Structure formats: C-alpha cells, structure tokens
Design a protein around this ligand. Structure first.
Ligand SMILES: Cc1cc2nc3c(=O)[nH]c(=O)nc-3n(C[C@H](O)[C@H](O)[C@H](O)CO)c2cc1C
Ligand SMILES: Cc1cc2nc3c(=O)[nH]c(=O)nc-3n(C[C@H](O)[C@H](O)[C@H](O)CO)c2cc1C
Ligand SMILES: Cc1cc2nc3c(=O)[nH]c(=O)nc-3n(C[C@H](O)[C@H](O)[C@H](O)CO)c2cc1C
Ligand SMILES: Cc1cc2nc3c(=O)[nH]c(=O)nc-3n(C[C@H](O)[C@H](O)[C@H](O)CO)c2cc1C
Ligand SMILES: Cc1cc2nc3c(=O)[nH]c(=O)nc-3n(C[C@H](O)[C@H](O)[C@H](O)CO)c2cc1C
Ligand SMILES: Cc1cc2nc3c(=O)[nH]c(=O)nc-3n(C[C@H](O)[C@H](O)[C@H](O)CO)c2cc1C
Ligand SMILES: Cc1cc2nc3c(=O)[nH]c(=O)nc-3n(C[C@H](O)[C@H](O)[C@H](O)CO)c2cc1C
Ligand SMILES: Cc1cc2nc3c(=O)[nH]c(=O)nc-3n(C[C@H](O)[C@H](O)[C@H](O)CO)c2cc1C
Ligand SMILES: Cc1cc2nc3c(=O)[nH]c(=O)nc-3n(C[C@H](O)[C@H](O)[C@H](O)CO)c2cc1C
Ligand SMILES: Cc1cc2nc3c(=O)[nH]c(=O)nc-3n(C[C@H](O)[C@H](O)[C@H](O)CO)c2cc1C
Ligand SMILES: Cc1cc2nc3c(=O)[nH]c(=O)nc-3n(C[C@H](O)[C@H](O)[C@H](O)CO)c2cc1C
Ligand SMILES: Cc1cc2nc3c(=O)[nH]c(=O)nc-3n(C[C@H](O)[C@H](O)[C@H](O)CO)c2cc1C
Ligand SMILES: [Cl-]
Ligand SMILES: [Cl-]
Ligand SMILES: [Cl-]
Ligand SMILES: [Cl-]
Ligand SMILES: [Cl-]
Ligand SMILES: [Cl-]
Ligand SMILES: [Cl-]
Ligand SMILES: [Cl-]
Ligand SMILES: [Cl-]
Ligand SMILES: [Cl-]
Ligand SMILES: [Cl-]
Ligand SMILES: [Cl-]
Ligand SMILES: [Cl-]
Ligand SMILES: [Cl-]
Ligand SMILES: [Cl-]
Ligand SMILES: [Cl-]
Ligand SMILES: [Cl-]
Ligand SMILES: [Cl-]
Ligand SMILES: [Cl-]
Ligand SMILES: [Cl-]
Ligand SMILES: [Cl-]
Ligand SMILES: [Cl-]
Ligand SMILES: [Cl-]
Ligand SMILES: [Cl-]
Lengths: 66, 66, 66, 66, 66, 66, 66, 66, 66, 66, 66, 66
C-alpha cells in the first residue's frame, strides 16, 4: 500500500522549542497534505546580546503521497 | 559497588517536551525504585489536522538495582 | 575573515529545557564576548523522589575570537 | 556537469523489505525522472495483533536534475 | 496521556531477515501486551562452513504500558 | 517568526570539492529563493582509469520559505 | 530458533573498567539466565577530590530467552 | 586466544538483500578461511528504468587469523 | 607522560576549505602553544546572492599542555 | 542553579587506559576546580617497533563553574 | 552479478584535500584493479610550527573483485 | 608524500582490554610492516558461566604502505 515523503524543515520562534516546531508544522500544513508524523533532528539558536533571540528546531515531517 | 539498569521509555503529552518526559518518569516511578538519572534519546510526535497532537519523547532512565 | 571558538557547557534548571540553556548562555556571557550561536547536544536530568529535580542541557556555544 | 537531488521517502508493504522499497521507488518513478541510486536509511514497522502488518522502509533516492 | 516501553530483542532465523524479526516479535507477544511498533537497529549473522546459518536481526519493540 | 526548508543536493565537478558545492548551490539558486546556509554531509567520487573523474559532494541547503 | 533479549546495564567500580563490567555481568547473572555476549556502550565516571572514585561502564548484555 | 580480521565487502544481486549478502560471503569463502560472523553496514542499490536492478549490501565479515 | 587539550574552532574564508582551516590554525597558534594535530568536524557556509560568500570549517585542534 | 563546562582532553600513558585517563584528570585538577564527572570519547595509540608505546585516551571532563 | 571490496586508505599531501585523496587513489591503482568509487571518511592533519604541514584524508575505495 | 592502509582487527584475551589489543597488534606486526597508530572501534566479549571469558577489542591499525 502506502508511500510517504519526508521533508526537513527548521522552524523558528523567539519563545521556545515547542513553538518553533509548531511554526514549522503550520507552514508545512499550508502547502502539503496528509501530515502524519515528525521527528526532531536538531535544536539550535541565535544569541543576541547575551540571550537567545531565536530557537531553531529542525524537524523531519512525514506525509502521505497520494 | 552498585549496578544500574537503563530502560528505554517514551512518554507522551499533548502539551510538550517537559510534560512528556515527566509522564514517562512518573510511570517508571510507580513500578521501579531508585530512579537516579535520565537522558533524552529522541523527540517525535503525531500530527492531527495540521497541528501536533502528541509530543513523544523517548528517554533512557537509569536506576539502581539492589 | 573571522575565527570562532566553540565551548561545551551544560546548563541546569529545576524548571525545564529553555531555562537550562538560558542559564548556560547567561554564565557564558559574563565571561566570554561576542556570543553568536548555540547548538543543543544533549538533554539529561536528575531524578529525586520519582520526579525530575534538575534538567541538564548540554550545549555548544559559538563565539567570535578577536 | 550533473547535479542530483536526494529525496527521502518511506515505502510500505505488508510483505517485507524489498517490496516496501520497490513501492517507494515505483511512486517516485511516476512523479520524478532519472532515478539513479538509492540508500536504505531505516527499517521500521507496525505491529497488529502480535504480528507485523506493515514493513516501513525509509529510503533516500538520488536522481538527476536537468 | 500514554507511556511506552521500548525493549531491545534480537531474533534469529536460518531463513533470513523478515523471519528473524517475526520470531522476535512472536516471542515478545507471548510475554508482553499492546505491541505497537518496531525498528530494526542492526543485522548480523553466524557463518558456518562458508555460508550463513543464522540471521540475527536486533530490533526495538515499542509497546504500551497500562 | 520564520521557517526554513532544507533540501539535499549533490553537486558534481571534475575539478574538486569547492567547485562541486558551488555547482549544487548555483543549480539551487536558479530554482529556489532566499538561500541562507549550507552544510556538507558527504564527499564521494567516481574513479575512471585509476583517477578521480567526478567529485560528488552532497550538501544540505537551507532556505527561507515565505 | 533462538530469540535473545538485550538489556542495558551500567556497572560501577572504584578500581577500573574490567572490574566495572564484571560487576554488571555478575549482577545480571544472579537474576537472568543464559548470558551469551556483551558490548561496551560507554565509559564514564565520578570525580572526587581531583581523582576518579567510580568507573562507570555501561554495557549491553545479550541473553537467550527460552 | 585468537585474533580476527574484519574485511568490508559489498555483495550484489538483482534479487534482494539476503542474496546479495550470500554472494559476498560465498566470494569471501573462496579466498579466506574460518569465516565466523558478519554485520550488515549498509544497503544501497542501482535504479534502471524506474526499478531496482541491483541490490548492494555492504557487509563486514569477521574471520579467524591463524 | 604528556597530556593534550582539544579545542573546537571554526575558521572562515571567502576562498575555500583549506584557507578556512588555515585561518583557524593561525589564530590558535597566536594564543596557544605546541599545536600537534587537527581533525575536521564539519563544513558549513553562508550563501549571499546565490553564491557562497563564507566557507566555515569547524575543526578540533590538539595541543600539548605543559 | 549550577552551570558546568566540559573540556576535551586526551591523556597519555605507556601503561594503559586507566593510567591515561588519570593523567588527564590529574592535569585538569591542577588548573581547574570542582571536577565532577568524565566521559571517555575515544581510545587511540602510537605504535613503536611492533608494539604500543603510548595509550591515548581522549576524555570529556565536566566541572562546575562558580 | 558482481562483488566489491572496500579498502580504507589514508592519503597524505602538504598541499590539501584533493591532492591527498588523489595520492591515495594513485597508490591503490598501482596495486589494485577496477577502482570504481570512493568515499571520504575523515580529514585530519599534522601541525608543524603553527601551520598545517600534512593533510591526511582517509578514504574508502571500492573496487571490483573478479 | 606518504600513503597508509587501515585494517580492522579484533584481538582476544581472557585477561582484559589492553591485553586484547596488544595481541591484535602483535599479530599485525608479524605480517605487516611500519605500524604507526591504532584506534579502538569497539569492545565486546563472550560470557561463560556468569563470567567474561574472552575480551574482544576491535581495533583499526594504520600502517605505511611503501
Ligand atoms: C559554524 C557556524 C554555525 C552557525 N550556526 C548558526 C545557527 O545555528 N543559527 C544561527 O542563527 N546562526 C548561525 N551561524 C551564524 C552566526 O550567528 C554568525 O556568526 C553571525 O550570524 C554572522 O557573523 C553560524 C555560523 C557559523 C560560522
Ligand atoms: C517511518 C514511519 C515513522 C512513524 N513514526 C511515527 C511516530 O514517531 N509517532 C507516531 O505517532 N506515529 C508514527 N508513524 C505513524 C504515522 O502517524 C502513520 O502513517 C499513521 O498513524 C497511520 O498511517 C510512523 C509511520 C511511519 C511509516
Ligand atoms: C552512567 C551514569 C550516568 C549518569 N548520568 C547522570 C546525569 O546525566 N545527570 C546527573 O545528575 N547524574 C547522573 N549520574 C549520577 C546518578 O544520579 C548517580 O547514581 C547518583 O547521583 C549518585 O549515585 C550518572 C551516573 C551514572 C553511573
Ligand atoms: C516514538 C514512537 C514511534 C513510533 N513509530 C512508529 C513507526 O515507525 N511505524 C508505525 O506504524 N507507527 C509508529 N508509531 C505509532 C504507534 O504504532 C502508535 O502507538 C499507534 O499507532 C497509535 O497509538 C510510533 C509511536 C511512537 C510514540
Ligand atoms: C567482535 C566479535 C563479534 C561477533 N559477533 C557475532 C555475531 O554477530 N553473531 C554471532 O553468531 N557470533 C558472533 N561472534 C562469535 C563468533 O562467531 C565466534 O568467533 C565463534 O562463534 C566462536 O569463536 C563474534 C565474535 C567476536 C570476537
Ligand atoms: C555500494 C556502492 C556505492 C557506490 N557509490 C558510488 C558513488 O558514490 N559515486 C559514483 O559515481 N558511483 C558509485 N557507485 C557506482 C560504481 O561506480 C559502479 O560499480 C559502476 O559505476 C558501475 O558498475 C557505487 C556502487 C556501489 C555498489
Ligand atoms: C550532564 C551531566 C552528566 C553527568 N554524568 C555523570 C556520570 O556519568 N557519572 C556520575 O557519577 N555523575 C554524573 N553527573 C553527576 C555529577 O557528578 C554531578 O554534578 C554531581 O554528582 C552532583 O552535582 C552528571 C551531571 C551532569 C549535569
Ligand atoms: C552521491 C552518489 C552516490 C551514488 N551511489 C550509488 C550506489 O549506491 N549504487 C550505485 O549503483 N550507483 C551509485 N551512484 C552512481 C549513480 O548511479 C550515477 O549517477 C550513475 O550510475 C552514473 O551517472 C552514485 C552517484 C552519486 C553521485
Ligand atoms: C538551523 C540553522 C542553521 C544555520 N547555520 C548557519 C551556518 O552554518 N553558517 C552561517 O553562516 N549561518 C547559519 N545560519 C544563519 C542563516 O544564514 C540565517 O538564516 C541568516 O543568517 C539570518 O536569518 C543558520 C540558521 C539556522 C536557522
Ligand atoms: C589519519 C592519521 C591518524 C593518526 N592518528 C594518530 C594517533 O591517534 N596517535 C598518534 O600518536 N599518532 C597518530 N598519527 C601519526 C602517525 O603515528 C604518523 O604516521 C607518525 O607519527 C608520523 O609519520 C596519525 C596519522 C594519520 C595520518
Ligand atoms: C589523540 C591523538 C590523535 C592524533 N592524531 C593525529 C593525526 O590525525 N595526524 C597526525 O599526523 N598526528 C596525530 N597525532 C600525533 C601528534 O601529532 C603527536 O602528539 C606528535 O606527532 C608526537 O607527540 C595524534 C596524537 C594523539 C594523542
Ligand atoms: C546479535 C549477536 C551478537 C553477538 N555478539 C557476539 C560477540 O560480540 N562476541 C561473541 O563472542 N559472541 C557473540 N555472539 C554469539 C553468542 O555468544 C551466541 O549466542 C553463542 O555463542 C551461540 O549461540 C553474538 C550473537 C548474536 C546473535
Ligand atoms: Cl535528510
Ligand atoms: Cl531565524
Ligand atoms: Cl522516522
Ligand atoms: Cl538501547
Ligand atoms: Cl501517544
Ligand atoms: Cl548515561
Ligand atoms: Cl545540576
Ligand atoms: Cl555547528
Ligand atoms: Cl504503513
Ligand atoms: Cl549517497
Ligand atoms: Cl529492558
Ligand atoms: Cl522509535
Ligand atoms: Cl557525477
Ligand atoms: Cl543545520
Ligand atoms: Cl557509582
Ligand atoms: Cl550486538
Ligand atoms: Cl564567518
Ligand atoms: Cl583526534
Ligand atoms: Cl566536542
Ligand atoms: Cl602521547
Ligand atoms: Cl556528559
Ligand atoms: Cl571500516
Ligand atoms: Cl603523513
Ligand atoms: Cl584515524
């Protein structure tokens, strides 16, 4: 039966990890269809002043190809 | 002296990463004894609609065998 | 152009992942200068009673050497 | 001269590993062109009753961009 | 919500890879309950004469703890 | 705030590593927009006679989705 | 044929690496049966004063399930 | 006691994974002696038309040196 | 006898990989002493226009502590 | 609460692994303070004649920053 | 059809990465036959004065056994 | 200048890790020439009764080809 595609995206947020991945999954939902699962590959961030100003979570999203 | 066992559990939460690991550690605490440390091995999730509905954190938990 | 040094630090917090990394980055900012980016290498923790009492996030922080 | 794109797909089959990858490569062949090589990244599966009902092989497929 | 345990088992078979994992999953199903997914970690084997006499596939099996 | 996509490309050159990645980035720039960073994942090549005739560098390219 | 379970243990010793793994295998031998092979995953330790006071070797032990 | 050498071979087959490794092991058995164990390192393949025409399993074979 | 320290630095150059590492090693040579070996951990870069404007090679440098 | 720094050192000894790491930890203890834990990253060595004359164990040492 | 052997060599050069691998492939072509592909495993080097005097690229070369 | 070959051997010993590698390096020195360095890839062992009877250290040995 089924075939899936896995794209790598990195979501950003000034607020934290969960927010960063949700942004990435929201932006994927706009353009792709049948989002099933994801996997966090990596957590990074930008430092401004002496503080984190962007959390950057890169993520693999699995979705059904029809 | 002592010997430790490491078990692999994956906790689930609709709320996020810290809640998902806490759930895993709570469930381990009911059945095992002398939980000492843990390590996150992996963060994954399920997507429903175009949103994350389950954060799935898999974790290794170390505990003393007596 | 520029050369950067990457140091490995692990931040601690009784509250969670983002707080743990912020602590690490705060302490780095006191002593180093020109902090540019970071990467999370590893999330660990201590368990007291049957609950997490310390989140330990180890992180690599990149900063410009002048 | 040539530049290649690598896409990550996961093929499914109730029958086994080879069949799962063939399904993934068939579905890629429908939409893409000049498939040259593949690499198995990962073998997973779903368990129903106490038996495997889906073999899930994830695969990287390299193809020529023209 | 839910919590899963992941155990590592290595199944054996003189016939090949799918049979080896099925054996492992069968033996897990006898003793454990609510087997949900698995992941192949590793494929090894024993060589007798100049031929493979045992396929050894080590696998991670996830199951719901209730 | 922002969201990035990461695509995997492998560039080719009969001259060497830098040229191979530049080709890949050139070809990505024709079709994609807002290329921000890249990472080398892997260096391979084809041998013809007893000499390298193609350097194949596979690379991950990050770019802003708008 | 045979199906094996692999458990992860970490043995401790104030003396060194071999002693640490032997303690882990001894404690496994008390409770499990048909220990066949082991693999070292990791060597760690505790530092007291400015000296190692515990060698911590984590180890995967494979054993036959009957 | 003994000392072993591990050589890396990749076997090929138009039929599948088990056949590919058997070929590699057969060819090793012709030239080497006392083949004891193997480990799969990697599964790759060539695509011709839109179909797999070669399965290429690379494998590490351990054998006793006398 | 001798004990070594390994620091992680990332060198930059608009020209390529070797120049980037040389810059890192030059800047290490100014401040440290007895540089013995290095290892490349990682090759990254910045893209400006549709072209690489900085090669970023991160490197581990080993040097004798006396 | 607390923040730790992890430094990478490689200790040497003509005698063996434990001696090598002890030398590394001794040299760290002279200069740094509040050494808490270590992890072995890697074991290497130099061969002179047809024998090992230096054991080189590289190690990560964690210590409290105050 | 076929069977390949992979050997691991490390080529050296005072000039850089491409030269180092070419040396390794040249020396392999003298003694082996039917060199098909290679893969860079690792880039290291020796530092003399405060400068790189040898680039050491270790490489895996695949060649047809007939 | 120079070119090195890396071979993978696994040394055995009922006594421990250092002895097992020394055996591997001794057996390599009988047949090969100009052994320069080695790296430990892996520590395994056989369990007899409830005790380790063979320590199996696999090692990569680098030697000059002339
Ligand atoms: C090796 C390397 C890694 C970097 N990683 C990141 C990153 O993960 N996130 C980020 O926002 N910027 C990253 N940067 C950009 C960094 O913040 C940069 O030095 C300044 O943004 C421009 O000098 C990286 C730069 C280098 C050289
Ligand atoms: C390779 C692969 C990985 C998957 N990983 C997950 C996961 O991490 N979490 C999850 O809830 N479901 C996972 N699923 C199940 C996925 O959500 C599935 O397609 C639907 O649940 C049923 O089609 C996975 C499926 C595949 C094929
Ligand atoms: C292999 C190993 C790993 C450990 N990792 C951690 C850790 O990540 N964080 C921590 O607070 N303690 C850690 N500990 C210490 C653990 O909590 C310890 O058993 C008690 O603190 C003292 O016995 C570790 C201990 C061992 C043996
Ligand atoms: C960490 C994790 C990994 C999973 N991986 C897979 C998978 O690889 N394939 C799959 O079909 N389902 C997967 N699932 C879904 C699993 O079968 C799930 O529990 C049920 O499908 C719904 O509860 C996964 C779930 C979790 C939590
Ligand atoms: C490093 C090492 C790895 C081994 N791996 C396996 C294995 O994966 N499967 C197996 O049946 N035997 C394995 N053996 C045992 C091997 O077959 C052994 O030499 C004979 O069984 C007894 O000498 C291994 C032995 C060593 C030293
Ligand atoms: C395991 C494997 C890996 C290969 N890798 C490459 C590669 O990285 N680049 C390439 O041009 N060809 C590669 N080839 C193709 C190789 O050059 C092939 O043997 C001839 O091109 C056709 O026989 C590979 C073949 C195999 C079996
Ligand atoms: C990231 C991390 C890793 C640690 N790993 C270990 C370990 O491997 N062994 C150990 O005995 N203690 C470990 N500890 C505990 C460490 O010794 C701790 O700081 C003191 O024991 C209590 O502060 C670890 C602590 C942290 C934060
Ligand atoms: C990065 C890369 C990896 C490759 N891997 C393989 C492989 O695993 N097996 C294979 O038969 N050919 C492989 N090839 C060769 C591929 O099939 C090639 O593009 C055509 O054979 C000649 O253009 C590879 C080529 C590249 C550039
Ligand atoms: C996950 C991630 C990785 C990045 N890595 C790098 C890098 O390696 N080098 C770099 O110069 N900039 C890097 N950047 C910064 C990137 O160029 C950035 O999007 C722009 O510099 C500012 O938006 C990175 C950014 C992200 C989100
Ligand atoms: C890829 C590579 C790795 C090396 N690793 C080591 C090492 O781990 N320890 C060491 O003492 N020397 C090492 N050497 C140096 C080696 O012993 C060298 O050939 C002689 O010391 C000088 O020719 C290495 C050399 C190369 C080319
Ligand atoms: C952990 C370690 C790694 C080393 N790696 C290398 C290497 O990659 N190349 C090299 O030429 N020498 C290497 N050396 C040798 C290093 O240059 C050595 O300190 C001097 O050559 C003799 O003291 C290494 C030494 C150690 C201890
Ligand atoms: C996955 C696997 C790994 C093994 N690894 C080893 C090993 O590292 N050393 C060894 O002596 N035997 C090893 N064996 C052989 C093991 O000891 C075996 O069960 C008995 O020797 C014959 O049943 C392995 C067997 C399996 C299935
Ligand atoms: Cl990917
Ligand atoms: Cl950003
Ligand atoms: Cl996945
Ligand atoms: Cl595990
Ligand atoms: Cl769930
Ligand atoms: Cl641990
Ligand atoms: Cl802490
Ligand atoms: Cl980085
Ligand atoms: Cl499926
Ligand atoms: Cl590839
Ligand atoms: Cl378990
Ligand atoms: Cl999983
Ligand atoms: Cl090409
Ligand atoms: Cl990245
Ligand atoms: Cl302890
Ligand atoms: Cl194993
Ligand atoms: Cl830069
Ligand atoms: Cl090193
Ligand atoms: Cl590091
Ligand atoms: Cl030394
Ligand atoms: Cl650690
Ligand atoms: Cl190898
Ligand atoms: Cl050299
Ligand atoms: Cl090496």
């Amino acid at each position: 039966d089924h075939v899936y595609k896995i794209v790598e995206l990195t979501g950003s947020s000034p607020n934290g990890i969960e927010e960063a991945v949700n942004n990435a999954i929201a932006r994927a939902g706009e353009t792709l269809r049948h989002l099933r699962w994801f996997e966090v590959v990596d957590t990074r961030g930008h430092i401004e002043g002496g503080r984190v100003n962007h959390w950057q979570v890169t993520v693999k999203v699995g979705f059904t190809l029809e």
